[PDB]
Amino acid sequence: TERIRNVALRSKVCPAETASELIKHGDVVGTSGFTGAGYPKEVPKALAQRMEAAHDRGEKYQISLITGASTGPQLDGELAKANGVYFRSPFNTDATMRNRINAGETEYFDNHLGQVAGRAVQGNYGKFNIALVEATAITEDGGIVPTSSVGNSQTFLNLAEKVIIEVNEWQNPMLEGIHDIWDGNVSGVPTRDIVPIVRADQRVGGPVLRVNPDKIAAIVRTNDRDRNAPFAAPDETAKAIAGYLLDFFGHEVKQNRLPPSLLPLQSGVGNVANAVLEGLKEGPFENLVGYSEVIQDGMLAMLDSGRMRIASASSFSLSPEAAEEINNRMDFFRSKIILRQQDVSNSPGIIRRLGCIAMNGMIEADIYGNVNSTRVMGSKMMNGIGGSGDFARSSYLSIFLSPSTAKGGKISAIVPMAAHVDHIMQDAQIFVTEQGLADLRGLSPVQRAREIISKCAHPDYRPMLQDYFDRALKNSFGKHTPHLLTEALSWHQRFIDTGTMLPS
Amino acid sequence: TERIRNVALRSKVCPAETASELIKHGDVVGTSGFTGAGYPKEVPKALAQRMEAAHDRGEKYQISLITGASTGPQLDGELAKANGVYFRSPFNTDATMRNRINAGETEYFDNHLGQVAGRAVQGNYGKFNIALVEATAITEDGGIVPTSSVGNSQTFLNLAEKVIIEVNEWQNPMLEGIHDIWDGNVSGVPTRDIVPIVRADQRVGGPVLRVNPDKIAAIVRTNDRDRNAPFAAPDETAKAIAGYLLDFFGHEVKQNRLPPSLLPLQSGVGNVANAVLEGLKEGPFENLVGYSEVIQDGMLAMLDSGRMRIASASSFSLSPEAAEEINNRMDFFRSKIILRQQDVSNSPGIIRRLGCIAMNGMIEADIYGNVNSTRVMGSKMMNGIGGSGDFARSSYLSIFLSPSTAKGGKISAIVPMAAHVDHIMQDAQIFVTEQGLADLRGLSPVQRAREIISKCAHPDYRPMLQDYFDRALKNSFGKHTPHLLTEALSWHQRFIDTGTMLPS
Ligand SMILES: CC(C)(COP(=O)(O)OP(=O)(O)OC[C@H]1O[C@@H](n2cnc3c(N)ncnc32)[C@H](O)[C@@H]1OP(=O)(O)O)[C@@H](O)C(=O)NCCC(=O)NCCS
Ligand SMILES: CC(C)(COP(=O)(O)OP(=O)(O)OC[C@H]1O[C@@H](n2cnc3c(N)ncnc32)[C@H](O)[C@@H]1OP(=O)(O)O)[C@@H](O)C(=O)NCCC(=O)NCCS
Ligand SMILES: [Cl-]
Ligand SMILES: [Cl-]
Ligand SMILES: [Cl-]
Ligand SMILES: [Cl-]
């Protein structure tokens, strides 16, 4: 059936290429897209071509690209191969775009996902020229129905001078109704509203993005698939980590420090976080509730089980085999899920109010439990802080999950001093590896160290860590948080210098 | 007139010393006290004596001491001289207690002030045995009227098994009515309430702390003064910092990025933050609003001016000369001020909703704008993170203020890499020194560095910083956030090694 149900706007359809010409050099461009779901696909490819062309003729052609979160190959990928982005924000997982960022070719700054909207409205990123948003359909009265994510779309539509909509008939029409967009002022000019979300399954707004039709300069019909990263089956390390965490939960429930149905759960994606979710499905806990950034395959499974009553997120991030399952009983799942604006799904006030249990991965943690989420050796960007900082600081319990080693043994997940800090000690309470679970609740730095080292570190690095501690204790400039400054970062420089952390 | 207006509770008055015997060894003790205002004074002194005594006879006598924030000599001071605290939290400024912490003699963990209550209720600090709260008066129906701060008092009263109240006739009786205590569930068991503060001058609760009278084991009559740290007059460096910030404000107002009356202001205390406030009083801005942790002399002056309509905080922190002024027209000021629970004054949801401008000091910042608020050389505790993390991450604008050098030139406020991280890049946007103002809005790490270095660093260190950058750029393991790991911390080790950061 016909996707553009507003009669007049049909008059605004043109081809991807013609739409692309609307985007000038130096434009700040806000787009939909979040964990490889619901980003514009055709216009960006078209824009790439024209950029490569204009480059080969010695003329400048680059844009500022602000998304919800990570996009996919058609957007981040293409625009990067074509050297088309001078500034990116706030979160990328594209290999090509990564290399561009790490080479200094694209300026990057990974803001907290929950704050991007507010900073955009504040003017931090400059005036927005284009909003480029993918849509399932346009309603009779001109509402834009989002696709597989909501992200920052509503904010970009309100800020941008001109708007381009891609109506993608690949997206399932029954996504319509799954979203909840708030009418008022979430991240605008203070004083902001109270967004009265008091329960994860609650709807406070409507199913469509709102925009002055006059700003819609172009509507492109499309049919292209999302980036559907495939199911990374849990290995031995991940299964082990799940085990320790489910034990800990079972114990918290026994001590009456959590109810039998736990609290609202936020997990990321990985094989790590993915395993935890498989653990929970078989585990003893029932009536679970997700209040996450993302709905991944795990949550889908439990929504099916009945193990999870409801899941709230800003986007999907399914695998081909999962995506397929949902498209069938999309009528069922539609009623167990809610997709919200990312500034609502990552609202500190709401996360804290619901008491979320945050479960996030990490590069590395130092012995005092500071966390590195982003910059390998402290300088080389991986993905970005994302929403881990939103959930870690705001959650009821802040849990970090990781294997004890990276690079088949050559890197220790636990180190003397993290090369980059994303989450300070205050923002991390439970660490889990395949070695064991550290519980830092109520501890001082020094006691945090005993816990992390003896519970989490790998046998091969435990001793060296213990040694770093013991001597640091004796010699540190202060004894409160003891450090040997001359060899704090040394384990890193040693990897930089020899490709391993183990020494001679 | 009589302070204990509940007739029956008068039957519970005893002397400080007898009350002190209620506190056993190994007790977890929650007390009032916040920025040297409204902490218990007589019972602690009494407890110290008895601790020194029991020590001299070879018996163990120590408590866990949880406050609102910093207390004063009668409490933190005394209990420290007597080696009486085994664990402290969450924020201290007492010299003796500091030394104890830095010597490993007291275990310390500086939680975010806004989160202390929630963590207490969660059980992180253990079961609470005693709550020891100073009071202005007890109402006819048994309400506890707080004194010069509210802090965590209400939570401690609800958690503690036994309660001891010090009714201190030194405190002004007309403090009664100035407080706003919320009846519901701010930091308790999820799901928590919406605390509907939508405006800084708004009252949402009542003027008294509530507690089962039966838990009140003892009421001690007292008459002793608060720690009234004296007015640290603004010097040349501070006056300069104020100047740059007031310029920046004037400019934001011109570009219509802030209204003429700015937004709700949060400043700490120091000569630094103190100067800013004197700047504002004379400046062009009117109709100002404080939504802070603390009311210091600056805000008092403007409340007098009419320059500030209203100020919200969790405590006072006045100087003798200021304290004197307010005690006179206490009827006037009472109506311009509101003291709230610290978990309300430092609520992320509310700070973000009101769009606060946060102005905090710092030890040091690295070139990429990470901030150190706590640990000199990364190991030696100073005060604690306090509420700087609550306000920085949640605020509309996050400003840090500091002189470019510490220790008469021997330390640079800006360094290659901060020894300890409290506030990540994301959480800091404006830096100001007596050199200049850096505006990092929308910049990548590398552009952040150009700004900080060229605007903020001291001439004597600028060159060495620039050199550290330039070479790091060429050689860093990644080019996104460039670092020379072997000399990142070097400027610090150099001070540790020679007492200066300047080299040979
Ligand atoms: C930090 C993060 C990369 C790790 O998560 P993960 O799924 O477990 O990733 P892995 O541990 O399996 O490996 C990721 C990469 O980082 C590398 N890595 C992991 N630890 C490392 C370390 N201590 N040093 C260097 N590299 C490391 C891995 O080798 C791997 O590299 P590869 O692609 O070349 O094989 C990821 O969680 C992330 O970027 N988090 C940021 C934001 C976030 O948490 N949002 C919520 C969920 S989407
Ligand atoms: C960071 C903080 C300690 C400095 O504030 P400040 O009093 O204005 O700074 P000052 O330079 O005037 O004095 C602070 C002390 O730290 C020292 N100091 C400052 N910078 C330093 C540095 N880079 N290295 C070592 N010491 C330093 C000063 O010499 C001074 O030491 P001393 O008085 O023992 O001789 C203080 O702001 C704080 O603890 N903040 C944490 C919590 C907070 O911001 N909450 C908000 C309301 S207060
Ligand atoms: Cl809200
Ligand atoms: Cl804690
Ligand atoms: Cl709230
Ligand atoms: Cl920004």
Coordinates of C-alpha atoms in Angstrom, one line a residue, chain B residues 1-470:
Chain B
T1 CA 12.3 31.3 74.5
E2 CA 12.2 27.5 74.8
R3 CA 13.5 25.5 71.8
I4 CA 12.0 22.1 72.6
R5 CA 8.3 22.8 72.0
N6 CA 7.2 19.2 72.2
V7 CA 6.5 18.7 75.9
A8 CA 7.2 15.0 76.2
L9 CA 10.5 15.0 74.4
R10 CA 11.8 17.4 77.0
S11 CA 12.0 14.2 79.1
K12 CA 14.8 13.0 76.9
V13 CA 17.4 15.7 77.6
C14 CA 20.7 14.5 78.9
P15 CA 24.3 15.8 78.9
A16 CA 26.7 15.5 75.9
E17 CA 28.8 13.0 77.6
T18 CA 26.0 10.6 78.5
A19 CA 24.7 10.8 74.9
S20 CA 28.1 10.0 73.6
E21 CA 28.0 6.7 75.4
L22 CA 25.2 5.7 73.1
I23 CA 27.7 5.4 70.2
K24 CA 29.5 2.1 70.3
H25 CA 32.7 0.9 68.7
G26 CA 32.2 0.0 65.0
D27 CA 29.0 2.0 64.7
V28 CA 28.0 3.6 61.4
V29 CA 27.1 7.1 62.4
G30 CA 25.2 9.5 60.0
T31 CA 25.3 13.2 61.0
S32 CA 24.1 16.6 59.9
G33 CA 26.8 19.0 58.6
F34 CA 27.6 20.6 55.3
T35 CA 30.2 23.2 54.4
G36 CA 30.9 23.8 58.0
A37 CA 27.3 24.6 58.8
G38 CA 25.0 22.8 61.2
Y39 CA 27.0 19.8 62.3
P40 CA 26.8 18.2 65.8
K41 CA 29.4 19.8 68.1
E42 CA 29.1 18.8 71.7
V43 CA 28.5 15.0 71.5
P44 CA 31.5 14.6 69.1
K45 CA 33.9 16.4 71.5
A46 CA 32.6 14.2 74.3
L47 CA 33.0 11.1 72.1
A48 CA 36.6 12.1 71.2
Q49 CA 37.7 12.2 74.9
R50 CA 36.2 8.8 75.6
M51 CA 37.9 7.4 72.5
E52 CA 41.3 8.8 73.5
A53 CA 40.7 7.3 76.9
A54 CA 39.7 3.8 75.6
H55 CA 42.7 3.9 73.3
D56 CA 45.2 4.6 76.1
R57 CA 43.8 1.5 77.8
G58 CA 44.3 -0.7 74.7
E59 CA 40.7 -1.1 73.6
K60 CA 39.3 -0.5 70.2
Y61 CA 37.0 2.6 69.7
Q62 CA 36.3 3.7 66.2
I63 CA 33.2 4.7 64.1
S64 CA 32.2 5.0 60.5
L65 CA 31.3 8.7 59.9
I66 CA 28.9 9.6 57.1
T67 CA 28.0 13.3 56.8
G68 CA 26.2 15.6 54.4
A69 CA 29.5 17.2 53.3
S70 CA 32.3 18.9 55.2
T71 CA 31.8 19.5 58.9
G72 CA 34.1 21.4 61.2
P73 CA 36.7 21.2 64.0
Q74 CA 34.3 20.0 66.7
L75 CA 33.5 16.9 64.7
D76 CA 35.9 16.0 61.9
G77 CA 38.7 17.8 63.8
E78 CA 38.2 16.2 67.2
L79 CA 37.3 12.7 66.0
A80 CA 40.5 12.8 63.9
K81 CA 42.9 13.9 66.6
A82 CA 41.6 11.0 68.6
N83 CA 42.1 8.6 65.8
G84 CA 38.4 7.7 66.0
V85 CA 37.2 7.3 62.4
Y86 CA 37.9 4.2 60.5
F87 CA 35.8 5.2 57.4
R88 CA 34.7 8.6 56.3
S89 CA 32.3 9.8 53.6
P90 CA 31.7 11.7 51.4
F91 CA 33.5 15.0 51.7
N92 CA 36.0 16.5 54.2
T93 CA 38.0 19.7 54.5
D94 CA 39.4 19.2 57.9
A95 CA 43.2 19.4 58.0
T96 CA 43.6 16.7 60.7
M97 CA 41.1 14.4 59.1
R98 CA 42.8 14.9 55.7
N99 CA 46.2 13.8 57.0
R100 CA 44.5 10.7 58.5
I101 CA 43.0 9.9 55.1
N102 CA 46.2 10.5 53.3
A103 CA 48.1 8.3 55.8
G104 CA 45.8 5.4 55.1
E105 CA 44.5 5.7 58.7
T106 CA 40.9 6.5 57.7
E107 CA 39.4 4.8 54.7
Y108 CA 37.7 7.4 52.5
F109 CA 35.4 7.4 49.5
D110 CA 34.1 10.7 48.1
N111 CA 30.7 9.9 46.5
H112 CA 28.8 12.5 44.5
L113 CA 27.1 14.6 47.1
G114 CA 23.8 14.2 45.3
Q115 CA 24.0 10.4 45.5
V116 CA 25.1 9.8 49.1
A117 CA 21.5 9.5 50.4
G118 CA 20.5 6.9 47.8
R119 CA 23.6 4.9 48.4
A120 CA 23.1 5.0 52.2
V121 CA 19.5 3.7 51.7
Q122 CA 20.8 1.1 49.4
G123 CA 23.1 -0.2 52.1
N124 CA 26.5 0.7 50.6
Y125 CA 27.7 2.1 53.9
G126 CA 26.3 -0.6 56.1
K127 CA 23.4 -0.5 58.6
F128 CA 23.2 2.9 60.3
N129 CA 23.4 2.7 64.0
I130 CA 23.2 6.4 65.0
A131 CA 22.0 9.5 63.5
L132 CA 23.4 12.6 65.2
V133 CA 21.6 15.8 64.1
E134 CA 21.9 19.4 65.1
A135 CA 18.6 21.3 65.4
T136 CA 17.3 24.9 65.9
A137 CA 14.2 23.7 67.7
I138 CA 11.7 20.8 68.0
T139 CA 8.1 21.7 67.0
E140 CA 5.0 21.1 69.1
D141 CA 4.2 17.9 67.1
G142 CA 7.8 16.6 67.2
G143 CA 9.3 18.0 64.0
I144 CA 13.1 18.6 63.9
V145 CA 13.9 22.1 62.6
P146 CA 17.4 21.9 60.9
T147 CA 20.0 24.6 61.5
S148 CA 22.3 26.2 58.9
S149 CA 22.3 23.3 56.5
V150 CA 20.0 20.5 55.5
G151 CA 22.3 18.0 53.9
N152 CA 21.5 14.3 54.4
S153 CA 19.8 14.7 57.8
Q154 CA 16.3 13.5 56.8
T155 CA 17.8 10.3 55.3
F156 CA 20.0 9.6 58.3
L157 CA 17.0 10.0 60.7
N158 CA 15.0 7.5 58.7
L159 CA 17.9 5.0 58.5
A160 CA 19.4 5.1 61.9
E161 CA 18.3 2.7 64.7
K162 CA 18.8 5.4 67.4
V163 CA 18.8 9.2 67.1
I164 CA 20.6 11.9 69.1
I165 CA 19.5 15.6 68.6
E166 CA 21.6 18.6 69.6
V167 CA 19.4 21.6 70.1
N168 CA 21.8 24.5 69.7
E169 CA 20.6 27.8 71.0
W170 CA 23.5 29.5 69.2
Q171 CA 21.6 29.0 65.9
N172 CA 19.1 31.7 65.0
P173 CA 15.5 30.7 65.8
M174 CA 14.3 32.4 62.7
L175 CA 16.0 29.8 60.6
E176 CA 12.7 28.0 61.2
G177 CA 10.8 28.2 58.0
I178 CA 13.8 28.5 55.7
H179 CA 14.0 24.8 54.9
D180 CA 12.1 22.7 52.5
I181 CA 11.9 19.0 53.2
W182 CA 10.2 16.6 50.8
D183 CA 7.8 14.2 52.3
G184 CA 8.1 11.5 49.6
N185 CA 10.8 9.3 48.2
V186 CA 13.7 11.2 46.6
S187 CA 16.6 8.7 46.9
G188 CA 14.8 5.6 48.3
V189 CA 13.7 2.3 46.8
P190 CA 12.8 2.5 43.1
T191 CA 10.6 3.5 41.6
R192 CA 11.4 6.9 43.0
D193 CA 9.1 9.9 43.0
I194 CA 9.1 12.8 40.6
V195 CA 10.1 15.8 42.7
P196 CA 8.3 18.5 40.8
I197 CA 10.7 21.4 41.3
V198 CA 10.2 23.5 38.2
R199 CA 11.5 26.8 39.5
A200 CA 14.3 27.7 41.9
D201 CA 12.1 29.7 44.3
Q202 CA 9.5 26.9 44.6
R203 CA 8.7 25.0 47.8
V204 CA 7.5 21.4 47.4
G205 CA 7.6 20.2 51.0
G206 CA 7.7 21.4 54.6
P207 CA 10.0 23.1 57.2
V208 CA 10.8 20.1 59.4
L209 CA 12.7 16.8 59.5
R210 CA 10.4 13.9 60.4
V211 CA 11.3 11.0 62.8
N212 CA 9.6 8.5 65.0
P213 CA 10.1 10.1 68.5
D214 CA 10.8 6.6 69.9
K215 CA 14.1 6.5 68.0
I216 CA 15.2 9.7 69.8
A217 CA 17.4 8.3 72.6
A218 CA 18.9 11.6 73.7
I219 CA 18.6 15.3 73.2
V220 CA 21.5 17.5 74.2
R221 CA 21.3 21.2 74.8
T222 CA 24.2 23.1 73.2
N223 CA 25.5 26.5 72.4
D224 CA 28.5 26.5 70.1
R225 CA 29.3 28.3 66.9
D226 CA 29.7 26.9 63.3
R227 CA 33.1 26.9 61.5
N228 CA 32.9 30.4 60.0
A229 CA 35.8 30.4 57.5
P230 CA 36.6 34.1 56.9
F231 CA 36.1 36.2 53.8
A232 CA 39.0 35.4 51.3
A233 CA 39.1 38.8 49.5
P234 CA 39.6 38.5 45.7
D235 CA 43.2 39.1 44.6
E236 CA 44.6 40.1 41.2
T237 CA 44.3 36.6 39.6
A238 CA 40.7 36.1 40.8
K239 CA 39.6 39.6 39.7
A240 CA 41.1 38.8 36.2
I241 CA 39.3 35.5 36.0
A242 CA 36.0 37.2 36.9
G243 CA 36.6 39.7 34.2
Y244 CA 36.9 37.2 31.4
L245 CA 33.9 35.3 32.6
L246 CA 31.7 38.4 32.9
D247 CA 32.8 39.3 29.3
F248 CA 31.8 35.8 28.1
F249 CA 28.4 36.2 29.7
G250 CA 27.9 39.7 28.2
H251 CA 28.8 38.2 24.8
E252 CA 26.5 35.2 25.2
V253 CA 23.7 37.7 26.0
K254 CA 24.5 39.7 22.9
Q255 CA 24.4 36.6 20.7
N256 CA 21.1 35.7 22.4
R257 CA 22.5 32.4 23.8
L258 CA 21.5 33.5 27.3
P259 CA 18.9 35.9 28.5
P260 CA 19.8 39.2 30.2
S261 CA 19.1 37.5 33.6
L262 CA 21.3 34.6 32.7
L263 CA 20.3 31.2 34.0
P264 CA 20.3 29.7 37.5
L265 CA 23.8 30.0 39.0
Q266 CA 25.8 27.4 40.9
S267 CA 29.1 28.6 42.3
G268 CA 31.3 26.9 44.9
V269 CA 33.5 28.6 47.5
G270 CA 37.1 29.9 47.2
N271 CA 38.6 33.3 46.5
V272 CA 38.0 32.3 42.9
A273 CA 34.3 31.6 42.9
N274 CA 34.0 34.4 45.5
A275 CA 35.4 37.0 43.0
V276 CA 33.1 36.0 40.2
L277 CA 30.2 36.7 42.6
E278 CA 31.6 40.2 43.3
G279 CA 31.9 40.7 39.6
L280 CA 28.2 39.9 39.0
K281 CA 27.1 42.3 41.7
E282 CA 28.5 45.3 39.9
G283 CA 28.0 43.8 36.4
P284 CA 25.2 44.6 34.0
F285 CA 23.0 41.5 34.6
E286 CA 19.9 41.6 36.7
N287 CA 17.1 39.3 38.1
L288 CA 19.6 36.6 38.8
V289 CA 18.7 33.3 40.4
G290 CA 20.9 31.0 42.4
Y291 CA 20.4 27.2 42.4
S292 CA 23.6 26.1 44.1
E293 CA 24.8 23.7 46.8
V294 CA 25.9 26.7 48.9
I295 CA 25.0 30.2 49.8
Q296 CA 28.3 32.2 50.3
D297 CA 28.9 35.8 51.0
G298 CA 28.6 36.8 47.3
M299 CA 25.1 35.5 46.9
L300 CA 24.1 37.2 50.2
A301 CA 25.3 40.6 48.9
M302 CA 23.3 40.3 45.7
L303 CA 20.2 39.0 47.6
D304 CA 20.6 42.4 49.4
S305 CA 21.2 44.3 46.1
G306 CA 18.0 42.9 44.5
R307 CA 20.6 41.8 41.9
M308 CA 19.5 38.2 42.9
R309 CA 15.8 37.5 43.3
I310 CA 16.2 34.2 45.1
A311 CA 18.8 31.6 46.0
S312 CA 18.4 27.9 46.5
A313 CA 21.1 25.8 48.2
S314 CA 21.6 23.0 50.8
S315 CA 23.5 25.1 53.3
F316 CA 25.0 28.4 54.2
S317 CA 28.8 29.0 54.2
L318 CA 29.2 32.5 55.4
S319 CA 32.0 34.5 57.0
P320 CA 31.7 36.0 60.5
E321 CA 31.0 39.5 59.0
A322 CA 28.3 38.1 56.7
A323 CA 26.8 35.8 59.3
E324 CA 26.4 38.9 61.4
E325 CA 24.6 40.9 58.7
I326 CA 22.0 38.1 58.0
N327 CA 21.2 37.5 61.7
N328 CA 19.9 41.1 61.8
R329 CA 17.6 41.2 58.8
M330 CA 17.1 37.4 59.0
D331 CA 13.4 38.2 58.4
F332 CA 14.3 39.6 55.0
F333 CA 16.8 37.0 53.9
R334 CA 14.5 34.2 55.1
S335 CA 12.2 35.1 52.3
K336 CA 14.8 35.2 49.5
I337 CA 16.4 31.9 50.5
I338 CA 15.5 28.2 50.4
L339 CA 17.6 25.4 51.9
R340 CA 16.8 21.9 50.5
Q341 CA 18.0 18.3 51.0
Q342 CA 21.3 17.9 49.3
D343 CA 19.9 15.1 47.1
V344 CA 17.4 17.7 45.9
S345 CA 19.8 20.6 45.5
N346 CA 22.1 18.2 43.6
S347 CA 19.5 16.3 41.6
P348 CA 20.6 15.7 38.1
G349 CA 17.0 15.8 36.8
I350 CA 16.4 19.2 38.4
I351 CA 19.7 20.7 37.5
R352 CA 19.3 19.8 33.9
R353 CA 15.6 20.9 34.0
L354 CA 16.5 24.4 35.3
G355 CA 19.4 24.7 33.0
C356 CA 22.1 25.6 35.6
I357 CA 25.3 27.4 34.8
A358 CA 27.9 25.5 36.8
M359 CA 31.0 27.3 38.0
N360 CA 33.6 25.1 39.8
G361 CA 37.2 25.3 40.7
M362 CA 39.8 22.6 40.0
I363 CA 43.2 21.3 40.9
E364 CA 44.4 21.0 37.3
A365 CA 43.2 20.3 33.8
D366 CA 45.0 18.4 31.0
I367 CA 45.3 19.9 27.5
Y368 CA 42.3 18.1 26.2
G369 CA 40.2 19.6 29.0
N370 CA 39.8 16.6 31.4
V371 CA 39.6 17.9 35.0
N372 CA 41.2 17.0 38.3
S373 CA 39.1 18.1 41.3
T374 CA 40.5 15.9 44.0
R375 CA 43.9 14.0 44.0
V376 CA 47.1 16.0 43.9
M377 CA 49.8 14.1 41.9
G378 CA 46.9 11.6 41.4
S379 CA 47.3 10.1 44.9
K380 CA 47.1 12.7 47.6
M381 CA 43.5 13.6 48.5
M382 CA 42.7 17.3 48.9
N383 CA 38.9 17.6 49.6
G384 CA 36.7 15.4 47.4
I385 CA 34.7 15.5 44.3
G386 CA 31.8 17.0 46.2
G387 CA 28.9 18.2 44.0
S388 CA 31.1 19.4 41.1
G389 CA 30.3 16.2 39.2
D390 CA 26.5 16.5 39.8
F391 CA 26.5 20.1 38.5
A392 CA 29.1 19.7 35.7
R393 CA 27.5 16.8 33.9
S394 CA 23.9 18.1 34.4
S395 CA 24.4 21.8 33.8
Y396 CA 23.5 23.8 30.7
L397 CA 27.0 25.2 30.7
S398 CA 29.9 23.7 32.6
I399 CA 32.6 26.3 33.5
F400 CA 35.9 25.6 35.4
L401 CA 37.8 28.4 37.1
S402 CA 41.5 28.3 38.2
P403 CA 44.7 30.3 38.3
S404 CA 47.1 29.0 35.6
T405 CA 49.7 28.0 38.3
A406 CA 49.8 26.6 41.7
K407 CA 52.5 27.0 44.4
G408 CA 53.8 30.4 43.4
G409 CA 54.7 29.2 39.9
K410 CA 56.1 25.7 40.6
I411 CA 53.0 23.9 39.3
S412 CA 51.1 24.3 36.1
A413 CA 47.3 24.3 36.3
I414 CA 47.3 22.9 32.7
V415 CA 49.2 19.7 32.1
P416 CA 49.9 17.1 29.4
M417 CA 47.7 14.5 31.2
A418 CA 45.8 15.0 34.4
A419 CA 47.1 12.7 37.2
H420 CA 43.6 11.9 38.2
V421 CA 40.4 12.4 36.2
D422 CA 37.2 13.6 38.0
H423 CA 35.4 15.3 35.0
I424 CA 35.9 13.9 31.5
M425 CA 36.0 16.2 28.4
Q426 CA 32.3 15.8 27.7
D427 CA 31.6 17.4 31.2
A428 CA 33.7 20.5 30.7
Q429 CA 33.0 23.3 28.1
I430 CA 34.4 26.6 29.4
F431 CA 37.8 27.0 31.1
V432 CA 39.0 30.3 32.5
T433 CA 42.3 31.4 34.0
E434 CA 43.9 34.8 34.5
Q435 CA 45.5 34.2 31.1
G436 CA 42.2 33.9 29.2
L437 CA 39.0 32.1 28.4
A438 CA 38.8 28.9 26.4
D439 CA 35.5 27.9 24.8
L440 CA 35.5 24.2 23.8
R441 CA 31.9 24.1 22.6
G442 CA 31.7 21.7 19.6
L443 CA 35.4 21.0 19.4
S444 CA 37.3 17.7 19.0
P445 CA 40.1 16.8 21.5
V446 CA 42.8 18.3 19.2
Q447 CA 41.0 21.6 18.8
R448 CA 40.3 21.6 22.5
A449 CA 44.0 21.5 23.1
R450 CA 44.7 24.5 20.8
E451 CA 42.2 26.5 22.8
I452 CA 43.2 25.5 26.3
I453 CA 46.9 25.9 25.5
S454 CA 46.7 29.2 23.7
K455 CA 44.1 30.8 25.9
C456 CA 44.5 29.3 29.4
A457 CA 48.1 28.1 30.1
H458 CA 50.8 30.2 31.7
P459 CA 53.4 31.8 29.4
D460 CA 56.1 29.8 31.3
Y461 CA 54.4 26.5 30.5
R462 CA 52.6 27.4 27.2
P463 CA 55.7 26.5 25.1
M464 CA 56.4 23.2 26.9
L465 CA 52.7 22.3 26.5
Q466 CA 52.7 23.3 22.8
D467 CA 55.9 21.2 22.4
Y468 CA 54.3 18.2 24.2
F469 CA 51.3 18.5 21.8
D470 CA 53.2 19.0 18.5

